[PDB]
Amino acid sequence: SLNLDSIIGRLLEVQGSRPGKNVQLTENEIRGLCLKSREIFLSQPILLELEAPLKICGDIHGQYYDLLRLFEYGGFPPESNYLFLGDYVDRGKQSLETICLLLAYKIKYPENFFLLRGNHECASINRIYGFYDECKRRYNIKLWKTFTDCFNCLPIAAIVDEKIFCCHGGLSPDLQSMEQIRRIMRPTDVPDQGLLCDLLWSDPDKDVQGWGENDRGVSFTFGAEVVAKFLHKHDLDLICRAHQVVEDGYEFFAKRQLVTLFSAPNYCGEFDNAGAMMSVDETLMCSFQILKPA
Amino acid sequence: SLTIKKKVEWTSDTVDNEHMGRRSSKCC
Ligand SMILES: [Mn+2]
Ligand SMILES: [Mn+2]
Secondary structure: OOOHHHHHHHHOOOOOOOOOOOOOOOHHHHHHHHHHHHHHHHHOOOEEEEOOOEEEEOEOOOOHHHHHHHHHHHOOOOOOOEEEOOOOOOOOOOHHHHHHHHHHHHHHOOOOEEEOOOOOOOHHHHOOOOHHHHHHHHOOHHHHHHHHHHHOOOOOEEEEOOOEEEEOOOOOOOOOOOHHHHOOOOOOOOOOOOHHHHHHHOEEOOOOOOEEEOOOOOOEEEOHHHHHHHHHHOOOOEEEEOOOEEOOOEEEEOOOOEEEEEOOOOOOOOOOOOEEEEEEOOOOEEEEEEEOOO | OOOEOOOOEEOOOOOOOOOOOOOEEOOO
């Protein structure tokens, strides 16, 4: 019933156009994408064990044109395997086209395309920062509730070849074993406190020793030493996260033990940033593809 | 094939921008 290849074809038709051309799918096609993606999310672990080669991407925030550029540089699926670290909606102008293409690719390739949950894949957040207004304007409130039910089943973290830990925000003072993540039940909202909250909200800070209060008002900050101790305890080599705008699209921390990815160029306006995508080959040999602002 | 179930190193063009004073923001 779900004509996936026609949906993807219509979503990719605006490839080659000036940034801003809309794709207006039907309400039933979008609701079909959400429900089928939701059941695929629930059938897969909440802590994904992934394998290289794959390409990792950071925040998109409804910048659909730059998502298509990112796919042009790294190859549209299934030419390359993808892992997104969340924050697909809000702030941008085309959050609907962004999330619909990512959900469709998740359904078309359930074992080579993966999406993690960001703090904006939460009804308490995306109601305010743009996604709800975009759903209400172009569709209805009922479709927004359907997106929420789908967002509550997104996986929380991913581990690539038992060596690269991936989440949207960062570490948590309540994260002692990876089994704690695997036991989180879905569907679930994002709490104001606890492990699930910190994995989507926390940030690294250079001027903090240990754990400190995050000026976002939510979760905590962690220093370069918490990263090194966390990597040594679980025999990991790198933490891969997003959640923060960075000038070059990437930013190292704790001597290349943690990296921050951001894939939305010209995000702040008052601060010009580039977008980056992390490419990892079979030997865990990593590099960066940079998306220069248009 | 499939993705879902070594040491991490970086290529020569990859630079370490940690101590390069790169600006970062948490929101806007
Ligand atoms: Mn975020
Ligand atoms: Mn974000």
